[PDB]
Amino acid sequence: GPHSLRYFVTAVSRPGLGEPRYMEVGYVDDTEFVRFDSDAENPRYEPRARWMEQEGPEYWERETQKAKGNEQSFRVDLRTLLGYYNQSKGGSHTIQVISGCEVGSDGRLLRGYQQYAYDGCDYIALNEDLKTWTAADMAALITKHKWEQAGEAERLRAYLEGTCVEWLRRYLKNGNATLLRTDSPKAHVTHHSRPEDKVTLRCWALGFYPADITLTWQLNGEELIQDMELVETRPAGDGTFQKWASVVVPLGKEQYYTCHVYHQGLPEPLTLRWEP
């Protein structure tokens, strides 16, 4: 299938309490592989997956210096954006960026992206063409114009088509036994009483990688998406994921409901019911 290299970066001011906190977290398909955090005892880029330990000290020193440079850059940005928005120096504010690329199974670029947010709202973003920017407001129009004079977009484009994709392939190769694996979901059903002669059936899926999964409830063959509680798929602390979907059904009728679990790790979708 396709794969992706993604960085989530945040800088958040805290007036009165020193310099902004700056964080970079990197992912290859749903697994955390690197991290920078300005509040660490010693702020350096560090591995977050065992396969990255193979990268030598030149990798770690380069990425560390890049991250410290990015930190100062975002510190300036925070000051700048107080000016654009006519805001005071006493409040805390947040810049977020998502930056990365996806390649298809042939190892070629499918899409690149770089989007920024300020205080939780769209700010500026590179378009799919990798040539122009969409500014969400007029503060961001100032940025758009600065970035257009500086050739920022072809600079970014060159990273996305060049460095980003080339490092993704490297990571997928060096970490293939972790990244290219599939852990199949193991599933079960729990049962809970409700008032009014009804019952919650909850279908659980545990232990799976990658994160993409689909849980449905059925009755005769109709999917009951119209009466389903669920949680977003979530990490379980060891590089695998979990999910549940529930449905409310009449007491004594729970044997006609089936949970179905769809995952790329499974040779065929799982089917199960409540076990009394």
Binding site: K66, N70, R155
Partner: peptide, 8 residues
């Protein structure tokens, strides 16, 4: 592997 970000 990460980008060097520009100032706004």
């Amino acid at each position: 592997a990460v980008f060097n970000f520009a100032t706004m």
